[model samples]
Target chain A: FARNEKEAKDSAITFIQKIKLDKVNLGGELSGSNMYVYNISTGGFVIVSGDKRSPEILGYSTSGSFDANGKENIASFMESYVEQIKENKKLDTTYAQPVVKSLLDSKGIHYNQGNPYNLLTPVIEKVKPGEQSFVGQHAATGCVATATAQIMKYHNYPNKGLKDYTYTLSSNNPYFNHPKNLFAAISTRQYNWNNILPTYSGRESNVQKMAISELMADVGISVDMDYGPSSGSAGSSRVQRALKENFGYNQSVHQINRGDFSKQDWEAQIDKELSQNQPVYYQGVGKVGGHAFVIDGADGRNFYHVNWGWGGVSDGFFRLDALNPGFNGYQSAVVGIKP
Target chain B: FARNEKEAKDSAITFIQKIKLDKVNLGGELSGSNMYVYNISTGGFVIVSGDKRSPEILGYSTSGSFDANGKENIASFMESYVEQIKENKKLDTTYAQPVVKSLLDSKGIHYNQGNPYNLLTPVIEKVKPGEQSFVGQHAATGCVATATAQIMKYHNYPNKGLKDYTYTLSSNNPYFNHPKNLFAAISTRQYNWNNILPTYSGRESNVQKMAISELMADVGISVDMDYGPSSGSAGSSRVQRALKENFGYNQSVHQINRGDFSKQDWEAQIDKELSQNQPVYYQGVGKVGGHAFVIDGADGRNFYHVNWGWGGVSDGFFRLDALNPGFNGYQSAVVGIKP
Candidate 1:
C-alpha cells in the first residue's frame, strides 16, 4: 500500500503508534537472525525474515482460524517492523521477553529446561528385516513379533527369523483362525484349541486374552519356534526363560507408579541404559492402542526415538511428551536389559 | 513488578509505546470481554481478562519454547495492559485491524471464511449393534462387513448379522485361515480354495484384494450367506445385484479425483444422502490407513460422524479436516444409495 520505502517506513511507524495507543502489546525479539512479533490475543506469531527494513514477511504461525482481517493485521504489523528496521529508527523489540518470563515463572511452566542433553553409546539405526520379516502382512498387532525380532537383532541374537517369533506368540489363541479376524487369519498355523483348550481349563482366561509377555514366555520356554506356549498355564517365566536362554540376556522389568518419577527422571533412566549400548525394550500405551517398541537412542532434543516393529512405520523420533498418558503413556517399563 | 495499579498502568503504556517505537505490531480485539493483543512476529496472542487494573491474567498463548525471559516479557506487557485498562485510560486497539486486512488481502488466504453452517435432514446418530454383531473380535478390517450389517439394519434389511456378510466375502482368500489375520480367521467356514481356486481361475486377483464393494457383490449374488462368492469372475455386478435384491435399493457409485472436489463439497454430498435418511457407505483413506464406514450424520460443526464397525473405536465424530491427506484423506467417493 506504500509507494516506496519512505512511505512504508512511515506507515509502519504510524501503525505501531496506533496499536500502542489502542493497547496492543506488539513485542518481539531482534536477538535472532529474523525479527518476530507475538500476537497476544490469537496465540500466533509472524516473522520478518531477510534484510532489516526491506525484509520479506517470511512466515506466519497461525491456527488457520483467524479471519482475513486478522491475518492482514499480522502482515501489516510485520511490514511496519521491517520498515522501522530499514529506517534504523530504534526498533523496540524489548517487550516480549519480560512478559513471557513473568507468565512462565508465575505459571511454573517448564518452558525450556528439559532433560539434559544425553547421547547414548553406539547409536543403533532402527533396523528390521525386509518385507519377509512381517508376520501378519497388514495387521499391526504383529508389531509384538516384529518388535521382538528388532530387539533380538539389536542385541545381536542369532537365528532371528520373524515367523520364528510370530508362530509362538499367536499359538493357542481362540481367535487365531476365525476367518473374519484379520489379525488371526494371517497367522502361520491353526489348531483345534478346544482339544488343547481342556488342558488349560484353569488358566483359560489368560490364554483367551493373549499378551506380548505371554508370547515371549512361550518362545523362551521352547527356545525355538517348534513349541507353542498355548498349551500350558500362562505365565511370565516363559518369557524370562526365552530372553535368558535364547537371547542370552536378563530383563529388569519395572512397573513404577506414575507419581514416583518425573518425566525427566524416567527419560534419564532410559538414557542410562541406552548410554551403555543396551537397547531398551519398552511396552506401553500408544495413541491408538497398547504397543511395544525398542528405544534405541535419544536425538539430544525433544524426542527419544524408537523402532516400532512395523517395518519403519513407527521407526524414528517420538516426542518425549508422548511418554505422558495423554500421549503414549510409557506407564509400564522394562527398564534395562543386559547379559 | 509494578508497585501499584498506577505503576502497572504506566508501565503497560510505556511498554506499548516502546514496542511501537521499536517497530513491534501488537494487534488484537477489545470488543470481547477480554483485552487481547496479537504479536505479529510470534503468531501467538496474550489475553488480559477481567476488569481494567487489578484484573487477572486469564491466559497467555506461548510455545513450549520462548525462554523464561521471553514469557516474562509477555506477562509484564499483559499486566501493564490490564492496569492501563483499569485506570479507565483511553487505550489504542485499532492498529492490528488495518495491518491484518492488508496482509490477508496480499496472501490470498481464506483466513476466516470456512465452510458455512449446514445441517442435512433427519440427523442420524452413529449406531451399532449392542454386542453380538462384530465379526472378527480384534481385526478392524471386518469393518466392511460390520458397516454392511449396520446399513442393512438401518434399512430394515432381513437376517442381518456380521458373519453372514463376512463368510460370503472372505471365501477362498488364503488369509481366511492364517490365524493371525483377524479379518479372515474368525470366518465361520473353511474351504479348500485349492479345490475351488480353479473355478475362479480368471478372477483370482480380485478375491485376493478384498473390498467393500466386492463383499456386497458376493452377498447379493448368493441372496444369502448359504453360499460364498468365492468361485467366479470378479466384477462389480454382484455388489450391484446385492444392493438391489437384498436392500431393495440402488446405489450410484461415483469415483472423483481428490483434486476435483473441495472438502466442503464432498461433505455436502454425504450430507445430502444422509438428509435423505440414507446412511452413506464411504470407503476411502482414513487417518491411519484405508478404511470404510457408514457416514450417518454431521454433528453441526466438525466431525461428519461415522460408524466404524469395530464397536466403539471410531464410533464418534471426526473433524472435517480429517478428510484431507494430512488427516484421513477421504479423497475417494461412492456417493449415494436410494430406494
Candidate 2:
C-alpha cells in the first residue's frame, strides 16, 4: 500500500501467516486449487529480460493453460477450461527436477567426472538454458527475484507443517482466497524456504545460479540479467470477472466499481503508484490477444507506456481511459531473466 | 578534507596543484627515490611455489646492492636508491613482452590497434627464444591492489594535465620540467594510449620487493612490511642524515620538513610509532640492516602480526618503543604493475 520496502516485507509475512492458517491448520484437505503448485518441485527464480532494453523478448509470458482440450476455440466452454488446466499444469516447471536436469545436460558435452573442478560444470552451464521456443539469444534466463529469496530465506524454509501439508489444504490455501498466488509461486527456479526440501524434490536453485556465476568469474562474465517491474493501475476494483482483463472491453457493460476512475487522480496513478519497469500480463482484450508487455516509462498521458511482444521502448500503447483506470495496467509484476 | 566525495576530489586536486608547483612550473623534478622499474626484458612472470595458497609470491624484503669495486659494500646506499626505484618494477616475468618479441618475428600483436581483443590471444601464447614464460593463468596469476580494464574504461583518464603530469612525476622523468618534452610525450601517448606507457622505474627498489595483486582496479593494493629510520649516516642535517631511506622514503628531506610528519609534535632520534595492523620498517644504530613487518593486531602489551616471508597470518610481536612513533617510517608510492 505504502511504497516502502520494509513495510511491504512486513505486510507479506502477516498476510501469509493469516492465509497460512486456513491452508495448513485443522487438517484441511488440499483441493484442485490448493494443490496448485507453481513448479514447487523446481527451484524458483524471477526471470526478467533485464531493464528497458527488450520487453517483448523478456517480458512475463507464461503458458496459457485453459482446459483439458488442446483447442484454440475460445467460444467453447471445453476450450476455456482446458486452456486453464493446461496453463495450471505448465505453472510448476520451477519444480521440475527432471526437466531442469535435462536442461542442464542439454548441452552436448559429456559430463566429465574425472575432473574435480568440473563437478559443478554442468550445473553452472545450465544457469541460463537457451530459450527453446521462438527466441534465440534474445530470450531471458530463469532467476529468482531478490525479494523472493529474502522471504524464502527469512522464513527458514521447510517449516514442518507447510512441508507436510503442501497442496493438501484447498479449504484454506491463499489460492482459494486471493486469485493470484503472488507469494506462493515465485517466477523462477526457487524453493519456498518455509516449505520442506526433500519432500518437494527440487532444491538448490540459488546454489546452481551462484555456482554458475562463480565458474564464469574468471571469464569476466555473468549468468543472469537482473530485473524488476513497471507501474500499477488502479481504475477497476478486485479485477472483476477477469473479463475486463481484455485490453478492449465493452466499457458500457463492464463498469468498474473499485474507486471512481473519474475521482481517482491520474498523477497519483502513475507517480504515487506502480513500481518502475515491471512487466504485466494482459488476460483479456487490453493488448494483443491476451499477451504480456513491460511498462518502460510513462508520461502523464496515462497511456500506460509499454514494451510489447513485438519490440521494446514503446512498441505498443495501453490507453489510460483516465475515466477507466486499470490496476493490471499499473500494479504489475516483472519476471527478471537469469540463465 | 571536506568529508564529502566532491569536495574531497576538489581538495585533492587543489592540494596536488599547490604542492605540484615545483614539477609543474619551476622546471623542478619530482622524487622517484622510492620508485623502481623492472626490466620485463628478462622473465615475463614469476611462478608461484606449488605449495602456496596465495595469489602472489615475492614479499617485499631488504637486500644490499653492489658497487663497481665490489669492495665498498654500498648495500646501504644501493638499498636506499633501489628503494626509491621500487615504486616502478615488480615480478619481471609477468610483463616480459618486449623480451619475447626480441626472439620471435613480430607477426601479429599490435599495441594501439584500437582492438585490445587482438592483443589477448597473442599475449597469452607469446614465447620468447631463450625464455619460456607465458601469460599467467589461475594458479600462476597472483595479484594485489591493481586496476582492471573494466574500471579504466569507465574512468575518463588523461583528464586535464593529470595524466601527463602524474605519469611524468611518477616515472621520475628527467625531462618532466621541460614543457616541450612533456607536451610531446602527452601528444604521443594520447594518440597511442597503450604503447609507450610510462611508469616509475624506481618502485622495485624503494619497497624492497613487491607482489602483483590481480583484483586491483584503478587502485593499487599496498602491503606495509615494516617502517623505521634508514640505515645510513649520509647527507647533511640531522633530519637528512637520520633519514637513511632503505625500502621507503620517496620524498626529499626538504619535502619532509614541509610535511605532516616532519612538523609533528615531538621528534627524537629514532621515534617509534608502530601499532597493530599498521605497517612498520626498522633500521639499526649505524648500518647493521633493516627489517620489514606488518602489525596484524594489537592487544595492549604486544602487537600480533604476520610475517609475509614466512607466509600465512601468524602472530608476531613488537613493543611500543620499537615503533618509533614520531619518526616517519617508510613513505611508499604506488607503482604500476599492470598494463
Candidate 3:
C-alpha cells in the first residue's frame, strides 16, 4: 500500500523517530490518499496512513494538546480516535474516492473548528476599558450587556434586581447606586462589588468579582448600554428587559427577526434552540463588528458553538450560515433559554 | 441530475431569483456530490451543482471580489471559473464519491485561502508607533526592517547606498541621518524624508515618500535596529548585511539553518526558491510571535503567499508547513533573492 510518496514519507519519518518526539516536518499531502502530514517542529500534526501493514502510524494534532509521545491529540480524542481508526483500518478497500474526504482535512481541523457540544464555560470575564488593571473601575458593559449577564449566569438568576438602580459612569459621568440585577447575574455589587476587579482567566474569586461587577452594571443598565470605544452598544428592546425585568426569564425567553424567517428559517431556529437544550442570545452586525454572541452548542456538519463575548475569546465552531463572508451581516436570535 | 436535496434546494431558489441577488441560506452540502451550498445575506456562496441540467447555478465566492450578480468572483475568477465550469457541466457520470471532493469545499474556500500567484504589491507602508495620525512620526522599524524595505521595493534598486547612516530615535534616542540601503530600498531620506510620513495605501508619492524614507533609514542602519516597544528588533545577521552591504542583493542572497536540513529538505528548498521566481526572506517564531515575513508565491495545495510585514495585513495563502498549529515555532528562509 505504501510503495511511494517517498514510501509514505518514509513511514512518517520512522513514525517520528520511534516516538522520541519533536523534530518532524513535511506538512503537505493527500496525493489522493497516501496520507502522510507530519510538522511538529513543536506544534501539531503527525498522521501517516498508507497501510495494510506498510506506512502505518496515524495520530497526533497538538491544538488539543498532549504529545512529545504522551499521545492525546487525535484532535484531542476525535470520536474515540475516529472510532478506533475506522474500526481497525478498513480504509475503503485501499482508498481513492477520498477516504472520508481525506479524513476530513486530516490535520487539526484548522485549529479545532470545534463544537461537538459545549453549552458551558461561563463565568465569563472582560471589562477592559483599555486594560491596565481596567481603569476607573467597572461599568463599561457591552458585549451587548455582556451577553446579557452570561445568560443570567446561565440561569442562576433573580435573587434580586427589579430596579433600585442609579447610574452614570462611562468613567466619570461618575456616581452609581445599584440593585437591579446586581449579583442576580451572580453575586452582589454596586461599585464596591467587593472592590477588586482585574482578574482574567483564573476567574478571580470574591464571588467572581462580585459576580462580574454586578453583571457588568446590571445588564448594562438593562440594555440601553452604549458605553465607550465607539461600540459598547446594546439593544434588542432591552433584551426582553434584561431577561424579564432583570434576571428571571419569566417562563422561557424569546425574540427573533432576522427579517422573520428564511435564512434556512434562521438556521432551523438555531437548530431548534440547540436541540432543545437551550442557550441562544446571538446577534450580528455587518463587517464583523456589532457582535453579541452565545449560540452555545450544536456541531454536526452545520457547526455552531460560538461564544465570543470575549474573555474566553473568539470561541469556535461557527458557520452560523457562512460567518466570515465579511464576518456577518445582520443576524438575530435569543431562543428558549433556561435554567 | 437535480431532482432532490429539495430539488437541489429549489434549484438554488430559482437560481437566486434569476440573479437579483442577496437572500440565500442552505450553506452545507456535498451528499457526496449533488453539491447544494448557498448562503448569501451579503457574504458569499451559491453553488447548486446537481446538474446535467436542473439544479445548476454553480459559481461565486466573494473573497477574491465581485458578486451581487455582477460576476468576477468564482474564487475571484478561479482559472477562468474552473475552466468554464469543467467544460460545460459534465458531472462525473452523475457523482458519488467526491466530485473534486465536492468542488473542493464548495463554499468560499474559507475566506479566500488564496495564492494562485502574486509576487508584487510592493509599495508597502505601516509605521504605526501606536498611531493617531502617527505620533512623533516614523522609525519604530521592526517588521524586521519592514520586510527589508519591501524586498527593496521589489527589485527597483541600488542607484545608491553604502553606509552614510546614523540613528538614535526609538523616539528621542533622537538624531538620525541616513544613506545605507536608502533609495536602494528606494529613494533619498535622512529625516525630513520630506516631512510627511502619514500615508497608508494610496502608496502616496513624493517618490513614495522619499523612497520609503530612504528604505526606512537605510534598513534601520543596516540592521542594528532594536527600536521601541518590547520589540522593534532585527537580526538575520543584519539580513545578510542589509542585502549585501546595503541593498544590492549582489548576484544572489543566502542563509539556511532550520537546524541544517530535512524538514523535507526545508520544504524542498522553499519549493525550489519559489519555483525559481525568487523572493523568500521568511523567518518564524513560536506561540506565534517573533516575526518578519515574505514568502511570495505558490498555491497548489501546499499554499504559501504570506507577506505579513504588516501593512498588507495578514496577507494570505499560508500553510508553509502547517501554519496555525500554535502559529509557528522556529523556521527560516532567505532564498536566491534577486535584485
In terms of TM-score, which candidate is strongest?
1
Candidate 3 wrongly placed segments (more than 4 Å): A1-141, A144-166, A170-295, A298-306, A310-339, B1-75, B82-339
- TM-score of the A chain in model 3: 0.25
Better of 1 and 2 by TM-score: 1
Residue A103 lDDT in candidate 1: 14
The per-prediction tally of clashing pairs is 105, 133, 5
Worst 10 residues of 3 chain B by lDDT: B110-119
Stretches of candidate 1 off by over 4 Å are A1-150, A153-156, A160-241, A249-269, A281-339, B1-150, B153-237, B247-271, B282-339
Candidate 2 residue runs with Cα over 4 Å from true position: A1-339, B1-132, B136-260, B263-271, B275-339
Tens-digit per-residue lDDT, A1-339, candidate 1: 112434433433343334111112233422333233323232332333334333333332222111112122122323334444444323333211000111111221110000000000111112233311212111121223334434543443332222323233233333233222111211232222222211111111222323222333333223222111111211122333445544445546333333357766777776776667665655544332223445666655434545443222113333333111222233444545554
Output the number of the lDDT-best candidate: 3
Interface RMSD (one decimal) of model 2 = 22.0
Lowest lDDT 10-mer window, candidate 2 chain B?
B96-105
lDDT of 3 by residue, A255-320 (tens): 776767766667777777656545577765433133565655554545555444443322434344
CA shift of B165, model 2, Å: 32
Q: Scoring model 1 with DockQ, what do you get?
A: 0.05
Q: Model 2 - which docking category?
A: incorrect
